[PDB]
Design a protein around this ligand. Structure first.
Ligand SMILES: [Mg+2]
Ligand SMILES: [Mg+2]
Ligand SMILES: [Mg+2]
Ligand SMILES: [Mg+2]
Ligand SMILES: [Mg+2]
Ligand SMILES: [Mg+2]
Ligand SMILES: [Mg+2]
Ligand SMILES: [Mg+2]
Ligand SMILES: [Mg+2]
Ligand SMILES: [Mg+2]
Ligand SMILES: [Mg+2]
Ligand SMILES: [Mg+2]
Ligand SMILES: [Mg+2]
Ligand SMILES: [Mg+2]
Ligand SMILES: [Mg+2]
Ligand SMILES: [Mg+2]
Ligand SMILES: [Mg+2]
Ligand SMILES: [Mg+2]
Ligand SMILES: [Mg+2]
Ligand SMILES: [Mg+2]
Ligand SMILES: [Mg+2]
Ligand SMILES: [Mg+2]
Ligand SMILES: [Mg+2]
Ligand SMILES: [Mg+2]
Ligand SMILES: [Mg+2]
Ligand SMILES: [Mg+2]
Ligand SMILES: [Mg+2]
Ligand SMILES: [Mg+2]
Ligand SMILES: [Mg+2]
Ligand SMILES: [Mg+2]
Ligand SMILES: [Mg+2]
Ligand SMILES: [Mg+2]
Ligand SMILES: [Mg+2]
Ligand SMILES: [Mg+2]
Ligand SMILES: [Mg+2]
Ligand SMILES: [Mg+2]
Ligand SMILES: [Mg+2]
Ligand SMILES: [Mg+2]
Ligand SMILES: [Mg+2]
Ligand SMILES: [Mg+2]
Lengths: 75, 50, 96, 77, 64
RNA sequence: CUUUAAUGUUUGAUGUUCUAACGUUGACCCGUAAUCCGGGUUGCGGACAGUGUCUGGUGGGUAGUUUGACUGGGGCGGUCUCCUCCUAAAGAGUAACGGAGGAGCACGAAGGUUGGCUAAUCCUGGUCGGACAUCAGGAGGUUAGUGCAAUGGCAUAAGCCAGCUUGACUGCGAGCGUGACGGCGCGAGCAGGUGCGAAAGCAGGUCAUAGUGAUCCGGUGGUUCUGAAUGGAAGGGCCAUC
RNA sequence: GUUUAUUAAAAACACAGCACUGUGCAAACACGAAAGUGGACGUAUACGGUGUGACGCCUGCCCGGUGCCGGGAGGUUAAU
RNA sequence: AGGACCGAACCGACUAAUGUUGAAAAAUUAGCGGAUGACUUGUGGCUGGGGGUGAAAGGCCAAUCAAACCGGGAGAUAGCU
RNA sequence: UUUUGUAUAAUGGGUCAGCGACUUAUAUUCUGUAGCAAGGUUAACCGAAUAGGGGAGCCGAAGGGAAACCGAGUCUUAACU
């Protein structure tokens, strides 16, 4: 899709190549937060005292839905 | 799946359409079939639309 | 209409139709009601004065649902095809 | 251990009207999957190989054919 | 007090000339492309409420 | 008409000033024998502050509530709808956290019809060529093939080629099958218009069985069926569809 | 020194001492639908919140995350 | 001089026995800690229920406290006995 | 009483006497009986007031269709064997 960035071209160059970078950092925040909720789920799952709390974040992983990354046509 | 929905709108001027599915990735061109139009009670051409 | 949790019958099925306000001011007339009104003129003002139709009725209609014997003259109504022949066979007259 | 526990609803196949039975027109005689019973005289064949009557009469099973295949026919008796 | 008719059931059932009720066939509202024309065509006319659930409708419609 | 300057002309933005709204929990006088309150004089801020309606943000400070079932106790793991075989005791059906596998599609041809055709695997002979390509004979017989898992089927081929095509069509439907119902399935034949074939005829999708979700709410198109005094219209209804 | 009156008196709470942070006074903060009160007839050597807890030697690296503070150029953005 | 020392009144409650339909709905007996201080006590006031007060135990608020007592909604609802 | 099952070591009851749990109102449907019968019946109210007036109105004798509309037919369909 087309996005309108005011600025001439080199004030554009920052935003277009920064909004991509901030998306990859945000996308990698969830992918590192999911992998730390899987530390709890994979450890205290069969435990009787911590099962009700591990299945509280075993169903919290299913609500993050990291946004997809498309490839630039500028190859 | 990859097969989406289209409608073949008649050419007899009346509003009548047969709805079918068509894969667009293999063939991006329109569909032309002579079908039956109950409004005018004749076999006419049905060009794809939507 | 409660079946333990599954979808009740009055909700499995879809709603249909619409209620027409013109049907509540239209009334049929049995062919035997013409011998009960007056000295031989049938209209809205005489049918509803002999308690054959309601007060708010405007479009009556005479069907073949009885046996006419007196020569009545239907003034303004919507007699059917079958009830028309029976009325004229007794000497009646139908107009507008 | 586990990884099983699946099945499908029974399709209720088999012969419905056995030999010597008086059937009407269009009444299903046998529901099959392949063609176990072949259509003979006065019976048809559905798209799913269902055999149905085409004229009222008495069902008859016979083994006509070079390959000794079961056939179903109808006698208009 | 007067019995209150179930307003939801009154919008889906109509009473015929011998006490039976007529209703509209389901499965004819959306995604009508998967369905064959023969399957659609047989769902168009109104049908009659079956014997098994004829007592569930009379309770919901005491006046109609 | 274009572009332009000057006056006025109505308005917006910013910046300095001003007192007159407003504030004063600065000072003095009176009600008054009263560190409350009101009035008066004055000084300082001054259209800022603050309050009312509307609005964007933040808001476990606070309030209402939710947080599935089966289960060889409960939790974890597994499962929840559909298709194929066995258990299923030679009609139909039949359970377990019993034993094994699949589906959430595909195709404008991979559908219809007319014409034609028949495989796997082996032996022998033959340039590259080889255990195994392509070819010529013989044995064999469907041990091959089927868009997709398994079962049943298929030579009149439902498997393999080519020509023409859109019946993958509209309104119906005698009579049956299977479900507690919602529903699902098979169907000769009738009416109107097509396709293939000389014609008899075949054609209402595909060898069959999985490839799918009701109602409410709303979107698009057609249709006077209705249209809250009347003529319209908005909004409903019906048909097709998302 | 205080604490679970009535099964726990303790290593828990408090404490003097230390640090950060807020507050220029009609102070911040609290009880109040508001007027008003406490803070205080106190004025930053004062008052409130948080953590640690005499005294001695000390308190290392990390600002990416979440808070808080500052910036105003640019993007997005409500009522009107 | 001292939130100093030993120790009666006074304030508490660390150990054991008895008591447990008790003399007592937490006491008696023998020992025990503080006892000029952040002490103790008499009389009268103030703070009240999602509130008070709390050297902080969810403690105390009339033998009742993870939300007092009385009356009302009220014959709440109870797929449970 | 509850259960697949109780002498059950599963629940309840110390005994007597008195009290203690399917009712009332208005609607709808079915059966019995009584009245009238293609008709049946009033409500409020008036009334020297269990009489008599009151037929506003309700149910039934006609159905089909979403509806206009048609009518012993009607809907679907261009039309139905
Ligand atoms: Mg629709
Ligand atoms: Mg909460
Ligand atoms: Mg509630
Ligand atoms: Mg459970
Ligand atoms: Mg069997
Ligand atoms: Mg058997
Ligand atoms: Mg059984
Ligand atoms: Mg094929
Ligand atoms: Mg052929
Ligand atoms: Mg074929
Ligand atoms: Mg297939
Ligand atoms: Mg109008
Ligand atoms: Mg419309
Ligand atoms: Mg001590
Ligand atoms: Mg204690
Ligand atoms: Mg103690
Ligand atoms: Mg003060
Ligand atoms: Mg500490
Ligand atoms: Mg540190
Ligand atoms: Mg001392
Ligand atoms: Mg004490
Ligand atoms: Mg003592
Ligand atoms: Mg001491
Ligand atoms: Mg002492
Ligand atoms: Mg006192
Ligand atoms: Mg108490
Ligand atoms: Mg509470
Ligand atoms: Mg109540
Ligand atoms: Mg109660
Ligand atoms: Mg409850
Ligand atoms: Mg029993
Ligand atoms: Mg038991
Ligand atoms: Mg016994
Ligand atoms: Mg025993
Ligand atoms: Mg005993
Ligand atoms: Mg016992
Ligand atoms: Mg018990
Ligand atoms: Mg007992
Ligand atoms: Mg009694
Ligand atoms: Mg009618």
């Amino acid at each position: 899709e087309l996005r309108v960035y005011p600025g001439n071209y080199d004030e554009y160059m920052t935003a277009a190549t920064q909004a991509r970078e901030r998306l990859l950092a945000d996308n990698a925040k969830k992918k590192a937060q999911i992998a730390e909720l899987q530390s709890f789920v994979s450890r205290f799952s069969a435990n009787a005292s911590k099962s009700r709390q591990a299945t509280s974040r075993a169903r919290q992983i299913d609500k993050i839905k990291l946004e997809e990354v498309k490839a630039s046509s500028r190859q | 799946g990859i097969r989406e929905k289209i409608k073949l709108v008649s050419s007899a001027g009346t509003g009548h359409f047969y709805t079918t599915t068509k894969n667009k990735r293999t063939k991006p061109e329109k569909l032309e079939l002579k079908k039956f139009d109950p409004v005018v009670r004749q076999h006419v051409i049905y060009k794809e639309a939507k | 209409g409660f079946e333990g949790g599954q979808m009740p019958l009055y909700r499995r099925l879809p709603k249909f139709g619409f209620t027409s306000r013109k049907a509540a001011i239209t009334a049929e007339i049995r062919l035997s009601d013409l011998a009960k009104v007056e000295g031989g003129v049938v209209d809205l003002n005489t049918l509803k004065a002999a308690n054959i139709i309601g007060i708010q009725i405007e479009f009556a209609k005479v069907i073949l649902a009885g046996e006419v014997t007196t020569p009545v003259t239907v003034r303004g109504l919507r007699v059917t095809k079958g009830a028309r022949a029976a009325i004229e066979a007794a000497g009646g007259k139908i107009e507008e | 251990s586990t990884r099983n526990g699946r099945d499908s609803e029974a399709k209720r196949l088999g012969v419905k009207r056995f030999g010597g039975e008086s059937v009407l027109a269009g009444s299903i005689i046998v529901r099959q999957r392949g063609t176990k019973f072949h259509a003979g005289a006065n019976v048809g064949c559905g798209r799913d190989h269902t055999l149905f009557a085409k004229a009222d009469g008495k069902v008859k099973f016979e083994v006509k054919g070079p390959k000794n295949r079961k056939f179903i026919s109808i006698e208009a008796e | 007090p007067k019995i209150k008719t179930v307003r939801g059931a009154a919008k889906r059932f109509k009473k015929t000339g011998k006490g039976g009720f007529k209703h509209k066939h389901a499965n004819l509202r959306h995604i009508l492309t998967k369905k064959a024309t023969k399957r659609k065509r047989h769902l168009r006319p109104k049908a009659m409420v079956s014997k098994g659930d004829l007592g569930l409708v009379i309770a919901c419609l005491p006046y109609a």
